Coordinates of C-alpha atoms in Angstrom, one line a residue:
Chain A
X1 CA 3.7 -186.5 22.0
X2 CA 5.0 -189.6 23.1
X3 CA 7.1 -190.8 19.7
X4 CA 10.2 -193.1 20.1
X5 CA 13.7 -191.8 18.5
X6 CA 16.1 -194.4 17.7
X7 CA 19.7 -192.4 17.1
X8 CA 22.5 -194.3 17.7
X9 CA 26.5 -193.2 16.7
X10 CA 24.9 -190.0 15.0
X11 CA 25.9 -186.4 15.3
X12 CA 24.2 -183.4 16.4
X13 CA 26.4 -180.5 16.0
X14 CA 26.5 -176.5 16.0
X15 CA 22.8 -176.8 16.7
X16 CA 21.9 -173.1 17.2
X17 CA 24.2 -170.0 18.2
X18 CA 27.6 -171.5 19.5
X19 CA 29.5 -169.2 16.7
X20 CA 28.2 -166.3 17.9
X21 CA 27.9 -166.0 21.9
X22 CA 31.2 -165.0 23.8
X23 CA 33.2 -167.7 26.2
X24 CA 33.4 -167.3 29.7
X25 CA 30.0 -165.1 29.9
X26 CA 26.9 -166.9 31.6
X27 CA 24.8 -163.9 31.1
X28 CA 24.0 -163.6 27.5
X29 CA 21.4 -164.7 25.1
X30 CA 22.2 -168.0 24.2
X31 CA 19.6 -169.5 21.5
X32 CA 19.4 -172.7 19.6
X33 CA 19.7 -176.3 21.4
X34 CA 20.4 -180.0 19.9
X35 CA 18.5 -182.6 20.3
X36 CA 14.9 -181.5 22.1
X37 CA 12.5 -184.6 23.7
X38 CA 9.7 -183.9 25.1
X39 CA 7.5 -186.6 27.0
X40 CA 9.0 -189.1 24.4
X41 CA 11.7 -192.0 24.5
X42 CA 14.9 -191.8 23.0
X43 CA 17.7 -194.6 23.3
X44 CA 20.7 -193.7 21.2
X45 CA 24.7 -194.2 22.4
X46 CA 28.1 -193.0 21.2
X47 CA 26.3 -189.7 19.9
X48 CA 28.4 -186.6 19.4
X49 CA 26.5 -183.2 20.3
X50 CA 29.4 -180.4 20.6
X51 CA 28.9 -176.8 20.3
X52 CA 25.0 -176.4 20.2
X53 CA 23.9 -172.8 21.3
X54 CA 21.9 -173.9 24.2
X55 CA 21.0 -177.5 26.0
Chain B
X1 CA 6.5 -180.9 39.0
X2 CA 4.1 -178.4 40.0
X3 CA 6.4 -175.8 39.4
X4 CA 3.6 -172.8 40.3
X5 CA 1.0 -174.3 41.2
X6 CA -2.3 -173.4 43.4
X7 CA -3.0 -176.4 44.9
X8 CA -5.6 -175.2 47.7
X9 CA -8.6 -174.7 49.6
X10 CA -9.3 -178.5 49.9
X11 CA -12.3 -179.7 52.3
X12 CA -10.8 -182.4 54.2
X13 CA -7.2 -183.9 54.5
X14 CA -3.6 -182.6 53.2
X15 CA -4.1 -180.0 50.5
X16 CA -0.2 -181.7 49.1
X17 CA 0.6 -185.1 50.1
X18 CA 3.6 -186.9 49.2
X19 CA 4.3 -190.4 50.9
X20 CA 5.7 -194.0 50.2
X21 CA 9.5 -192.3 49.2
X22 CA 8.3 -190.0 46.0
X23 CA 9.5 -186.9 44.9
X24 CA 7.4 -183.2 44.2
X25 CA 8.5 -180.2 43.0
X26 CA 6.4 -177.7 44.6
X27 CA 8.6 -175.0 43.5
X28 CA 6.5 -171.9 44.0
X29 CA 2.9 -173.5 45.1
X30 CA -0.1 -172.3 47.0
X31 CA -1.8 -174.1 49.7
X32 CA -4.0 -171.9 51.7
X33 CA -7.5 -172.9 53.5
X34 CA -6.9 -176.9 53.8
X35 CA -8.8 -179.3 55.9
X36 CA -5.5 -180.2 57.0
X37 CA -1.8 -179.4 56.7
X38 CA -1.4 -177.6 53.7
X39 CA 1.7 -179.4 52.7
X40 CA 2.7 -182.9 53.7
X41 CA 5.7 -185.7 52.9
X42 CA 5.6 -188.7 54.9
X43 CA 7.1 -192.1 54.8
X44 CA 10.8 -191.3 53.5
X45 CA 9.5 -188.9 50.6
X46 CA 10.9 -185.4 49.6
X47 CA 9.1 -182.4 48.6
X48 CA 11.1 -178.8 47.2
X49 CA 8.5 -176.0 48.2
X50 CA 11.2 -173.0 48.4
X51 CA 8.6 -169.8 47.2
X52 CA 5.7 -171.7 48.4
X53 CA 3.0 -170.3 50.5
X54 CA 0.6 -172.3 53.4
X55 CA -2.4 -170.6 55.8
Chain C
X1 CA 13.6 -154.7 26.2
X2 CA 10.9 -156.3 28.4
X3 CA 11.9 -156.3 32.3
X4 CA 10.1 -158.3 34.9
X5 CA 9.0 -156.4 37.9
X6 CA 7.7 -158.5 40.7
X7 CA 6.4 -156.8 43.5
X8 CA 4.4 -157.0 46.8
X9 CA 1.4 -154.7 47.0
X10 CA -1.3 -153.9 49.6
X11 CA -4.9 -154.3 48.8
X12 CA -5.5 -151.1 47.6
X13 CA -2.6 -151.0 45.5
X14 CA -3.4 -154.7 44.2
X15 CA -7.1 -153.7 43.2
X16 CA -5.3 -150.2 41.3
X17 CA -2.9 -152.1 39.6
X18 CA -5.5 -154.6 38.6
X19 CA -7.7 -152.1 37.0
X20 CA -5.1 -150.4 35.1
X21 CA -3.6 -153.7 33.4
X22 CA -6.8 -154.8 33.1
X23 CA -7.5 -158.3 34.6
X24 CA -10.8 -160.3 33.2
X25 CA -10.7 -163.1 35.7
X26 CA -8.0 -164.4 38.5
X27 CA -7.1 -165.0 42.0
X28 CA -4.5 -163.0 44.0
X29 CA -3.3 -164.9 47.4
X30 CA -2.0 -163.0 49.5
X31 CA 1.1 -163.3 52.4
X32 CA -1.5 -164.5 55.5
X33 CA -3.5 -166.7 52.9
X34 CA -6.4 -164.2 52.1
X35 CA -7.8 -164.1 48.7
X36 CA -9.4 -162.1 46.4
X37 CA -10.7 -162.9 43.3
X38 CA -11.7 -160.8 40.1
X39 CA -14.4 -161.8 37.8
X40 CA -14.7 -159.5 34.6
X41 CA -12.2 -157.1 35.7
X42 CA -14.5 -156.8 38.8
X43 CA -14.2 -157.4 42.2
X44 CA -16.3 -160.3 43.0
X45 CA -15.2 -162.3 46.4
X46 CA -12.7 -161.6 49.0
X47 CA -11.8 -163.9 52.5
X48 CA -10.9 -162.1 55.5
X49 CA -8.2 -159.8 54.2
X50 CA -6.6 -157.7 57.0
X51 CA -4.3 -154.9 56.6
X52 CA -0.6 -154.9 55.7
X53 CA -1.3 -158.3 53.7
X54 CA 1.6 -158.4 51.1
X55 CA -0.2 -159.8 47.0
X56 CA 3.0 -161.4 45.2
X57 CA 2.1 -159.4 41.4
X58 CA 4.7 -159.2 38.4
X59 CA 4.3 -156.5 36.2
X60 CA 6.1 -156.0 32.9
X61 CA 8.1 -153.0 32.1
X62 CA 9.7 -152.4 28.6
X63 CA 11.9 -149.5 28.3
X64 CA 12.0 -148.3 24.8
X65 CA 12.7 -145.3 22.7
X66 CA 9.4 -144.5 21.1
X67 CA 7.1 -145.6 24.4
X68 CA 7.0 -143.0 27.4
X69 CA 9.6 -143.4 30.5
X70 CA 7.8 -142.4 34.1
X71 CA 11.2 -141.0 35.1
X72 CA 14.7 -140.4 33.1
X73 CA 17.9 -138.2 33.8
X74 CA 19.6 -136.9 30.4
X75 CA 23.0 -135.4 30.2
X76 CA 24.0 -133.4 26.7
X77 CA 27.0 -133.6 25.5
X78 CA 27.8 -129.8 27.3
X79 CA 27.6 -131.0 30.3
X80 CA 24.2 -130.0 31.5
X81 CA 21.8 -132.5 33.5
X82 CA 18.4 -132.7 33.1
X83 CA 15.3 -135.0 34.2
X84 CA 12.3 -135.3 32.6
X85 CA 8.8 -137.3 33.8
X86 CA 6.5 -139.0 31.3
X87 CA 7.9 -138.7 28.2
X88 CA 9.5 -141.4 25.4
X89 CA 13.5 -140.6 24.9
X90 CA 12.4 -139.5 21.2
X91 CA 10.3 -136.7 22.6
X92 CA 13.3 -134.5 23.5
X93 CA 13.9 -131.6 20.9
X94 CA 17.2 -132.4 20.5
X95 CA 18.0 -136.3 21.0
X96 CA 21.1 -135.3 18.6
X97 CA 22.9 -133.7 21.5
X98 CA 21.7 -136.0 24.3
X99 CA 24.8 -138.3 25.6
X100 CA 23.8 -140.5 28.2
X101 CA 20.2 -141.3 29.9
X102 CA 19.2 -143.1 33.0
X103 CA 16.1 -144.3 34.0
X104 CA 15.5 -143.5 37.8
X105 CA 14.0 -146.2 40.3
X106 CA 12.4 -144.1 43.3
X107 CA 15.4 -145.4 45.0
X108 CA 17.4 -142.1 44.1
X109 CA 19.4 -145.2 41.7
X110 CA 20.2 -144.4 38.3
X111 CA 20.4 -147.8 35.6
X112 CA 22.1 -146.5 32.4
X113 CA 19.9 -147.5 29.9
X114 CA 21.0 -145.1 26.7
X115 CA 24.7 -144.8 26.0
X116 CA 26.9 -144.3 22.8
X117 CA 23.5 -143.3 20.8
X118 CA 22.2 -146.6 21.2
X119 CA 19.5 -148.6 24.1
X120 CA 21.0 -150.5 26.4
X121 CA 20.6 -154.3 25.7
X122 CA 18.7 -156.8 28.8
X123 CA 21.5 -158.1 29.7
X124 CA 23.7 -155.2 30.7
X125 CA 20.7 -153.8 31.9
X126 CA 20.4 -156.6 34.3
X127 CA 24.0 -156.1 34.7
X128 CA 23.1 -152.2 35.7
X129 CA 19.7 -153.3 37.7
X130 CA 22.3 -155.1 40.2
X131 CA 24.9 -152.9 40.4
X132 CA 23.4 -149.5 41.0
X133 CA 22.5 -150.4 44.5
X134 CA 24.2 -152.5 46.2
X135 CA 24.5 -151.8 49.4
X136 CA 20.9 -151.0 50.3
X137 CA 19.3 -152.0 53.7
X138 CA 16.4 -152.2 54.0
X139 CA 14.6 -151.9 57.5
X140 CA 13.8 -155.4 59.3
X141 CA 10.0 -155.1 60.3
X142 CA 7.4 -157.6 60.9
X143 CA 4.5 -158.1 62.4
X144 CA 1.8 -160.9 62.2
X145 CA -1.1 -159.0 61.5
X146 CA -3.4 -161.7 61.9
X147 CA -4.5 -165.1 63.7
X148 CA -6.7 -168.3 62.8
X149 CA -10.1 -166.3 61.9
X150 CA -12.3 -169.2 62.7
X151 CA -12.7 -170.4 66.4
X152 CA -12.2 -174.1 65.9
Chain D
X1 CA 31.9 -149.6 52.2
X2 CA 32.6 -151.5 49.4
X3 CA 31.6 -151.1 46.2
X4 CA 32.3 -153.8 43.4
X5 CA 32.0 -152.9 39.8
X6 CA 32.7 -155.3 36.9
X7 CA 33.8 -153.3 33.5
X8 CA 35.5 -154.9 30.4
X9 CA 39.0 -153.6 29.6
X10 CA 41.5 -154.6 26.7
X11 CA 44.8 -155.9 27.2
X12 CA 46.7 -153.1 27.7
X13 CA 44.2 -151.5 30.0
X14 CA 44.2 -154.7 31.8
X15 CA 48.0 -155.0 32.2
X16 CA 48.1 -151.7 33.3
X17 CA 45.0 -152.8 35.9
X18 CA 46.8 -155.5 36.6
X19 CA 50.4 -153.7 37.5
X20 CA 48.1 -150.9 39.2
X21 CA 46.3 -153.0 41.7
X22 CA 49.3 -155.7 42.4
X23 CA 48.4 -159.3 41.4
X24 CA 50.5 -161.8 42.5
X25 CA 49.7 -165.0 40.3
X26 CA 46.3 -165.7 38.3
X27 CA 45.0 -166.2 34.6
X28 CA 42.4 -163.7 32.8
X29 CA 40.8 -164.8 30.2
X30 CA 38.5 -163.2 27.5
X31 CA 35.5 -163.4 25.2
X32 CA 37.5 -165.2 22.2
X33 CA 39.4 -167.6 24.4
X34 CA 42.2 -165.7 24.5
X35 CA 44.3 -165.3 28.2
X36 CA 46.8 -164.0 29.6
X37 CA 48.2 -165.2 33.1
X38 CA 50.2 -162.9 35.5
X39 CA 52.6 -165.5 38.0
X40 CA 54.5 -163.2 40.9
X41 CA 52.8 -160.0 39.1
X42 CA 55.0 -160.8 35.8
X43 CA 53.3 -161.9 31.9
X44 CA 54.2 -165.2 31.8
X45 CA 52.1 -166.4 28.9
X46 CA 49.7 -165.1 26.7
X47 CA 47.7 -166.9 24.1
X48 CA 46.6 -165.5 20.9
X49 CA 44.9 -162.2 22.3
X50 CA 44.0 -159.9 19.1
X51 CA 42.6 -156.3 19.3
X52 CA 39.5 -155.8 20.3
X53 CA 39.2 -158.4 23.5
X54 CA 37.4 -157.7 26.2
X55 CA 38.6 -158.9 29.5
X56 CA 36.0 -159.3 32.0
X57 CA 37.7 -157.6 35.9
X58 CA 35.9 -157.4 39.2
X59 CA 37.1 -154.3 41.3
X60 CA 36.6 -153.2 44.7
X61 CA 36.7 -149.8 45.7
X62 CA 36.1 -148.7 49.4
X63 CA 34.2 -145.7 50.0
X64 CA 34.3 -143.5 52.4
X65 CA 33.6 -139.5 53.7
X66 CA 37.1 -139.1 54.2
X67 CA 38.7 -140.8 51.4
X68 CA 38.9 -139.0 47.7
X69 CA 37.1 -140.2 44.9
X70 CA 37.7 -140.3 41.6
X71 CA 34.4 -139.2 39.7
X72 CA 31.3 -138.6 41.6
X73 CA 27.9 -136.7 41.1
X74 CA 25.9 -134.9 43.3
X75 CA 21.8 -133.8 43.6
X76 CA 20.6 -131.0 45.8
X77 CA 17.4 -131.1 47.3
X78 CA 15.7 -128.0 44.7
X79 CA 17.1 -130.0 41.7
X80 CA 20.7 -128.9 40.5
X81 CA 23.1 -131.8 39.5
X82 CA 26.7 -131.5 39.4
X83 CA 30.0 -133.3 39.1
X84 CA 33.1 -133.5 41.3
X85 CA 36.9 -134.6 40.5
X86 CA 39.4 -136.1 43.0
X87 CA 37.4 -134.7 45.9
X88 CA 36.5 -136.7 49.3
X89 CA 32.5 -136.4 50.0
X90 CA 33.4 -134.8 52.9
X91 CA 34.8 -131.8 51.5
X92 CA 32.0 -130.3 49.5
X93 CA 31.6 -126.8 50.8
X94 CA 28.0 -127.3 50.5
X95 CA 26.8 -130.6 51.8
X96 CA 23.3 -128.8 54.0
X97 CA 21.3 -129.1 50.5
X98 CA 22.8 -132.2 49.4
X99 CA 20.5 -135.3 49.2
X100 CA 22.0 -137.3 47.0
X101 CA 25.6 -138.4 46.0
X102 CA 26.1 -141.3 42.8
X103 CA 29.5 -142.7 41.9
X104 CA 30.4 -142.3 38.2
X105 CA 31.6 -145.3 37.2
X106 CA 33.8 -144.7 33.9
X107 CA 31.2 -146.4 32.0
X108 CA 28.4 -143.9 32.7
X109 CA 27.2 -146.3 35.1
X110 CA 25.7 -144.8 38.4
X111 CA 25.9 -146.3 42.1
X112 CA 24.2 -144.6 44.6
X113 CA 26.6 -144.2 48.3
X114 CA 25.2 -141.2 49.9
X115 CA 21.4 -140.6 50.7
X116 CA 19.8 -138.3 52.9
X117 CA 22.7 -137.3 54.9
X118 CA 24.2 -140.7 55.3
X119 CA 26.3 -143.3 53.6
X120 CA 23.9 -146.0 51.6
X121 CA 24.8 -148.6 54.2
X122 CA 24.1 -146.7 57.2
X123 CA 20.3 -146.0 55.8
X124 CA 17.5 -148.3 56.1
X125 CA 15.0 -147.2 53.4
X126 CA 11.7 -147.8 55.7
X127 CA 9.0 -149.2 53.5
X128 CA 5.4 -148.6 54.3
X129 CA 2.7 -150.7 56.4
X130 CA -0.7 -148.9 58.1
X131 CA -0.6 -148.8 61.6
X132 CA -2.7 -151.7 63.4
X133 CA -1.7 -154.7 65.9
X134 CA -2.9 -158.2 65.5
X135 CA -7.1 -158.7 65.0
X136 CA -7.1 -161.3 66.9
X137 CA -11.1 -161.3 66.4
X138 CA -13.0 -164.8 65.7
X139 CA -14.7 -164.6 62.6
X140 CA -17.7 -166.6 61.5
X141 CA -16.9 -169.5 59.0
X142 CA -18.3 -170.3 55.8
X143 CA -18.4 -174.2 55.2
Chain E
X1 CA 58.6 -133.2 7.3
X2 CA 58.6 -136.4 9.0
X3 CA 60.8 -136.7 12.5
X4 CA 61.6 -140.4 13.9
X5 CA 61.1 -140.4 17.5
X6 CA 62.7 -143.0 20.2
X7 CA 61.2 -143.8 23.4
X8 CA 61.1 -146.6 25.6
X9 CA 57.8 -147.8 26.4
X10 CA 56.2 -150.5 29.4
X11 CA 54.2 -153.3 27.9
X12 CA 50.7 -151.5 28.1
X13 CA 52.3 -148.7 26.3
X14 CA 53.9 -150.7 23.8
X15 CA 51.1 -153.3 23.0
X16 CA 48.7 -149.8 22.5
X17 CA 51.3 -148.5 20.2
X18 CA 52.0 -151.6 18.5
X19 CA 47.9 -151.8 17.9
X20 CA 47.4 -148.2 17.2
X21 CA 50.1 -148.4 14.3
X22 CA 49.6 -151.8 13.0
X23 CA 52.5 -154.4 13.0
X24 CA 51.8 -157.3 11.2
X25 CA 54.7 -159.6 12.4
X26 CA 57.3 -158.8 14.6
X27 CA 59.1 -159.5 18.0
X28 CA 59.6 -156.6 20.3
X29 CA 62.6 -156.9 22.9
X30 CA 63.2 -154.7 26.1
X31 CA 65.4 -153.7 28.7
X32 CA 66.0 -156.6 30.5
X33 CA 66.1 -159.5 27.8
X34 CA 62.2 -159.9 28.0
X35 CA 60.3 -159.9 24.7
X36 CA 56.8 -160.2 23.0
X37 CA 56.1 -161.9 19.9
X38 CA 53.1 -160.2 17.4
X39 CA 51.8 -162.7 14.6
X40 CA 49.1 -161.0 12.5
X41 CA 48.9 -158.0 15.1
X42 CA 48.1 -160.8 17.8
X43 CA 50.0 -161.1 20.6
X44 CA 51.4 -164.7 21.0
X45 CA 54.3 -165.3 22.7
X46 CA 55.6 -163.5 25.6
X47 CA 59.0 -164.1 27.8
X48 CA 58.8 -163.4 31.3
X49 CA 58.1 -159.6 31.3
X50 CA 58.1 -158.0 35.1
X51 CA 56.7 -154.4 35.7
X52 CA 58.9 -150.8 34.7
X53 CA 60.5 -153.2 31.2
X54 CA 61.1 -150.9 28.8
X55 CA 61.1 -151.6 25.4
X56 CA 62.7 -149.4 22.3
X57 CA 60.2 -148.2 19.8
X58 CA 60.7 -145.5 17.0
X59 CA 57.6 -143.5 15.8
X60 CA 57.6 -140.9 13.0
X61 CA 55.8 -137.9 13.7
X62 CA 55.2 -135.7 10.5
X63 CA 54.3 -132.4 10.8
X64 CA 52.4 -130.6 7.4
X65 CA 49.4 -128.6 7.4
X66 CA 46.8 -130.5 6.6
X67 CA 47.3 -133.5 8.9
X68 CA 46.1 -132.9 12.5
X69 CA 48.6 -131.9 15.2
X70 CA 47.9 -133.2 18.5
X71 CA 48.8 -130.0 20.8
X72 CA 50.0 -126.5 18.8
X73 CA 50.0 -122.8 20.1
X74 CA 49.2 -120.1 17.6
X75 CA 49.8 -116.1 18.0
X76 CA 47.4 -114.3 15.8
X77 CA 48.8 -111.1 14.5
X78 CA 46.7 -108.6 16.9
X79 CA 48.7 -110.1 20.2
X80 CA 46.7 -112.9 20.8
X81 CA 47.8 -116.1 22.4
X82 CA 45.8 -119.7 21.7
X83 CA 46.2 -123.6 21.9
X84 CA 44.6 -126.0 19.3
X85 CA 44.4 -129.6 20.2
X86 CA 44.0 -132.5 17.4
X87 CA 43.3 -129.9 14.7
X88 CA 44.8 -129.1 11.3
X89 CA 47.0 -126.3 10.8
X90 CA 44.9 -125.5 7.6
X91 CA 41.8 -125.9 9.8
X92 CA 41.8 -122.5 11.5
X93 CA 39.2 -120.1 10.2
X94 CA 41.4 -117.6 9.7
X95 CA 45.1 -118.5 9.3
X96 CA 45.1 -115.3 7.7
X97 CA 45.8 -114.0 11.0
X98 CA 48.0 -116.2 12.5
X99 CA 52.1 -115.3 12.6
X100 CA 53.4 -118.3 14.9
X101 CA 52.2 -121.7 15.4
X102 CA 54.6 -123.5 17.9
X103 CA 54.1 -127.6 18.7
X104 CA 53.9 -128.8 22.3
X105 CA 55.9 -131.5 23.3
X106 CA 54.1 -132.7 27.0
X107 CA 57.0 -130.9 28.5
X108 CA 56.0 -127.5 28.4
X109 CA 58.7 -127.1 25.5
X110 CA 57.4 -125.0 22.2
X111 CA 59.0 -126.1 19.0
X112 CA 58.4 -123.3 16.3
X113 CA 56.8 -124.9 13.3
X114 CA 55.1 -122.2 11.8
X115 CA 56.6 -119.0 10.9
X116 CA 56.6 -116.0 8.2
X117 CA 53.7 -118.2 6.9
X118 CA 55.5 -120.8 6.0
X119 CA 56.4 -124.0 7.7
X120 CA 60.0 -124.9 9.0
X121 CA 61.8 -126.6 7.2
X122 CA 63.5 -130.5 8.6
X123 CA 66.8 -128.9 9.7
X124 CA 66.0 -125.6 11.5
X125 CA 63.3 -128.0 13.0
X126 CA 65.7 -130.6 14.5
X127 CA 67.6 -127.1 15.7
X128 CA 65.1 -126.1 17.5
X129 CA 63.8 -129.2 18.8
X130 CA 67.3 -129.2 20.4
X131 CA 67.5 -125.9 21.2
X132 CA 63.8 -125.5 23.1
X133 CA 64.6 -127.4 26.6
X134 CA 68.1 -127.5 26.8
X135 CA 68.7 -127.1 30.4
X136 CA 66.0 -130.3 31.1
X137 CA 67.6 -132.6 34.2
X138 CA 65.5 -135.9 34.6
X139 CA 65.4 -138.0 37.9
X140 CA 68.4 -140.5 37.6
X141 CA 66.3 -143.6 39.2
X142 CA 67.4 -147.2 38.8
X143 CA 65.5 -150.6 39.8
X144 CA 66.8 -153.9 38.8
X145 CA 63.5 -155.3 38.9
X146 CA 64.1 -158.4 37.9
X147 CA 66.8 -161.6 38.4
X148 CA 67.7 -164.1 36.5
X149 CA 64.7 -166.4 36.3
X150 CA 65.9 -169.6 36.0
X151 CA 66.9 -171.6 38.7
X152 CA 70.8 -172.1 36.9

């Protein structure tokens, strides 16, 4: 709804199912995702998102 | 994006229309019963209408 | 375990399948542009709809254990085979002995979808879906079936 | 006729795969991370593979009247299933009332090759239309 | 009445065993100087290991009454000849009945282990284990299969 995130040099991490899902499937249910916008404006560099479950 | 939309049954002129180089997504639309062409991209524009239907 | 099904269906198979999911109000186009429209889950206006004219409809299947199958194939653990029509997988007598069960497609294709006591999850079945037929061709036909009603 | 069937087997189901159907040089891996890689059909390396890993194989199998097959499963017309060992499709003494033939796929998978008194690729499973040629008829307009 | 039991075993064989009868830690070698490495019943590290390498295992197989036995052959006392597969001695309805139970080796070679009703004891057991296919000539069949590796 059109806020305005400001997030620079932070860390999203193991946002949603990484742990559980198995490697080197692309059929699975993969749930969970770091770092959602939606119709909003975002300006943040040198983040670190590894491992969320999905996007 | 008008990723399933029913764009259609206009009374005059293109029922889509993309021109002056834009972009649509007209993933799976419907443009039956136009005035004119149901879908139209002129002037260096793109359109992606791969399900879509026009008569 | 909730399966899209979509599917391509005459007029008269549209309108039945309309009824029986019941429909309140929407607009089915059709292959050649046609149209008809339902208002109150009734049939309100149609445009010049020939025959053969293929309605783009998907329906929801979910296969589960307490709702009724349409068509399954069951093997004990003997070794006997048997199909039943219309009933849920906990109807049989005797689930206890019951090994394997497939659900059958009208194709003559069997999808495993009950194995090792336990459903089959949606992504094996998907798995399955593809895999039990793969080499089916299917006839090449096509005709028009139609032409500009109006005379402009 | 091919038939390709993905199944998940452990390491030393794969190995023996592996050794079975020769593979000159390639790396498997499987659902923790762990691979192993096969160079000139030899175990070069293998990485931390524990019990219970699944490796993920693609196999072909060709099909055919005259050639055997391992498992298969066969419909009469009246109803009456049954199950066949090492025997080519060809060979069934009784193949007048047979209308269907599925390929038992060691995971109690089904693939359907024979149908109607042909192999799945030689039929054409007609779907259905009514009968009429083009209207071709001017209708009046509504505008 | 536990018997060790040397074989030589490929590397499917020998990774199933090794995981069947749980080996922390150790490193297997095999015919031909290859070897794999097992860290916490992982496999780790292996050498260059071609096809047909055999590798030296021992297994203890123990034979009592109430443990399963994979194959046996038991004559009841009327004349009647049967074969029990991954059952207990003890878990025969009525071992009243039964005079022999002999063990099955794969070969087609009975070892008596049950007699007088009584089991046989280690000795007369390695006796007869000797004594059962003594006339057994295997293939003699010998591939290299393998060169030294490095380019030297």
């Amino acid at each position: 709804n059109g806020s305005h995130i400001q997030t620079n040099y932070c860390d999203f991490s193991y946002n949603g199912n990484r742990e559980q899902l198995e490697e080197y499937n692309k059929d699975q249910n993969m749930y969970g995702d770091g770092l959602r916008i939606f119709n909003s404006s975002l300006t943040g560099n040198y983040m670190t998102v590894n491992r969320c479950g999905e996007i | 994006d008008l990723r399933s939309s029913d764009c259609s049954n206009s009374q005059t002129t293109y029922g889509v229309i993309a021109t002056r180089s834009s972009n649509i997504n007209f993933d799976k639309g419907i443009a039956n019963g136009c005035g004119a062409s149901g879908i139209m991209a002129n002037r260096g524009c793109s359109i992606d209408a791969t399900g879509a239907t026009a008569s | 375990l909730i399966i899209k099904h979509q599917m391509k269906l005459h007029l008269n198979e549209l309108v039945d399948w309309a009824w029986r999911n019941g429909v309140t109000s929407e607009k089915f186009h059709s292959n050649n542009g046609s149209y008809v429209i339902f208002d109150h889950s009734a049939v309100v206006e149609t445009y010049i709809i020939n025959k053969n004219d293929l309605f783009n409809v998907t329906e929801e299947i979910e296969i589960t254990l307490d709702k009724p199958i349409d068509y399954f194939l069951e093997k004990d653990m003997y070794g006997n085979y048997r199909e039943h029509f219309g009933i849920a997988i906990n109807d049989l007598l005797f689930l206890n002995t019951t090994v394997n069960i497939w659900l059958v497609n009208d194709d003559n294709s069997h999808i495993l979808i009950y194995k090792d006591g336990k459903l089959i999850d949606e992504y094996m079945y998907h798995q399955f879906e593809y895999e039990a037929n793969q080499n089916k061709h299917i006839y090449p036909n096509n005709k028009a079936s139609g032409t500009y009603p109006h005379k402009t």
